[PDB]
Design a protein around this ligand. Sequence first.
Ligand SMILES: Nc1ncnc2c1ncn2[C@@H]1O[C@@H]2COP(=O)(O)O[C@H]2[C@H]1O
Ligand SMILES: Nc1ncnc2c1ncn2[C@@H]1O[C@@H]2COP(=O)(O)O[C@H]2[C@H]1O
Ligand SMILES: Nc1ncnc2c1ncn2[C@@H]1O[C@@H]2COP(=O)(O)O[C@H]2[C@H]1O
Ligand SMILES: Nc1ncnc2c1ncn2[C@@H]1O[C@@H]2COP(=O)(O)O[C@H]2[C@H]1O
Lengths: 202, 201
Amino acid sequence: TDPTLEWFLSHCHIHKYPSKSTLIHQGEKAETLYYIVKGSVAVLIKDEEGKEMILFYLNQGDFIGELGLFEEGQERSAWVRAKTACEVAEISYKKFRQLIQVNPDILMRLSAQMARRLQVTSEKVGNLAFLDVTGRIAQTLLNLAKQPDAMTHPDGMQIKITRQEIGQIVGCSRETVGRILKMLEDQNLISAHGKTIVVYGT
Amino acid sequence: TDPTLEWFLSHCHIHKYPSKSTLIHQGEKAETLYYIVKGSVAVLIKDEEGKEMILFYLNQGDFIGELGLFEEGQERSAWVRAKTACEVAEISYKKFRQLIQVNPDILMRLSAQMARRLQVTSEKVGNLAFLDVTGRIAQTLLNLAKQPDAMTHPDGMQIKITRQEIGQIVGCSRETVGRILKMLEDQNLISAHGKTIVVYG
Ligand SMILES: Nc1ncnc2c1ncn2[C@@H]1O[C@@H]2COP(=O)(O)O[C@H]2[C@H]1O
Ligand SMILES: Nc1ncnc2c1ncn2[C@@H]1O[C@@H]2COP(=O)(O)O[C@H]2[C@H]1O
Ligand SMILES: Nc1ncnc2c1ncn2[C@@H]1O[C@@H]2COP(=O)(O)O[C@H]2[C@H]1O
Ligand SMILES: Nc1ncnc2c1ncn2[C@@H]1O[C@@H]2COP(=O)(O)O[C@H]2[C@H]1O
C-alpha cells in the first residue's frame, strides 16, 4: 500500500460533503490544505455577469487549496464545488509545513500535481488564444476521449457529457454547444447518440 | 544575502545567453533545472501555424524548466527565449533532488513560484474567456504602465512596446493591435508617440 499517504492522512481531519457542495469559497483567506480521499470536484472561476468557467476537474488522489500554502495572507484563487459526494482530508498549512521537514516527498507529490495543472492550464490558454468556438469544442471532445473514463466504441472513444458542461469548459452557452455538436455530426467527426458522444478516429 | 540561495547556486553551473537566444525548446527531454541570476526571459507557446503566445515573463530570481522535475521522461512544455542578455544558473534534476532531501526549503521556494504561476495563468484563462480583444489590450496597457520600467510622463505613464508583442500577449494580429490603439487615441485614453505609448492615468 502507501505508508506515506497513510502517514499523511493520520495528521488530517476527514470530512464528507454531499454532491454540489462548495468546498472552497473564492476570496477567502487560505490557511488550510485539502486532499480528496473519495469523489471528484470541479474548480471554477466566474465572470462579472455570473458566468462560470470550469478550470479543472480533480478526483481521488488530488490535493486542493494548495496555492495559498507558500505565502501568508493569500486568498483562495477559485471556487471548488463537490461534483459527487466527497470524502475530504484537511490539515493546516502550519502543520503541513512541519510534515514537509520530516518527509519532503509529500511536498513533491503536491508540486507534481501543480506542475501537471500548470501544463494543462497553459494548454487551455493556447486553445482560447488560437481557436474559435468550433475548434475549442473539438479539442475538448478529443481530450475527454483521452480520459480513462472514456468507454471503448467500434467507431472511436465514447464519452458521456452534458452540453451545459461542455459550455462551461470552452466558454460558451449550452445552446451554442448543441448547434456545434450537430455540425460535427454532419461533418462525420462525432456521433450524438442520445446520452453519449462517440468521438471518431480517437 | 541569502544562505539557502547561495547554498543552492554553489551547486549550479552558470551559463550566459545573449539576447534573443532560446534556453529551452518545447519537446526537449527535461533533465535540467534553471535559475535566472540576471536578465529576463519570455515563456511562450506556438500554434500549428506558427502564431506565438506569451505565457509569462520571468526575471532575476525565477527558476525555469521545473515542470519536468517531478516525473521522469517528461518533455519541455514550452519555449523560453532570452528577452535580454542572461546570466543563468543550471543544475541536473538528479543533483537537485538531493538538495531537496538535505534542505526542503529550496523546494518550498521553487513550489512557491509554481503556485503564483498557476494563479496568474488561471487569471489569464479568465482574461481570454471573458474579454474581447479590445478589453485585453486596455488591461494590458494598464498593467504595463504599472510596471517599474514605466517611465514617468506629464500626461500619465509611458511604456515602450511593439504591436507585435502586444498581439503575442493578448492573442491577435499586429494589424488588430494597431486598429484598437487608434481607437484608444480617439477616445483620448492613450497616445502613440512613436515607439512608446503614453497611458493617460
Ligand atoms: N488552473 C487550475 N488547475 C487546477 N487546480 C486549480 C486551478 N486554479 C485553481 N485551482 C485549485 O483551486 C483551489 C482554490 O483555492 P487555492 O488557491 O487555495 O487552491 C486552488 C487550487 O487547488
Ligand atoms: N464567454 C462566455 N459566453 C457564454 N457563456 C459562458 C462564457 N464563459 C463561460 N460561460 C458559461 O458557460 C456555461 C455553459 O452553459 P449555460 O448556458 O449553462 O451557462 C454558461 C456560462 O455560465
Ligand atoms: N504558464 C507558465 N507560467 C510560467 N512559466 C511557465 C509556464 N508554462 C511553462 N513555463 C516554463 O516553461 C518552461 C519550459 O519547460 P519545462 O516544462 O521544463 O518548465 C517550464 C516552465 O518553467
Ligand atoms: N489569435 C491570434 N491571431 C493572430 N496572431 C496571434 C494570435 N495569437 C497569438 N498571435 C501572435 O501575435 C503576434 C502579433 O503580431 P504578428 O501579426 O506579427 O504575429 C502574431 C502572432 O504570432
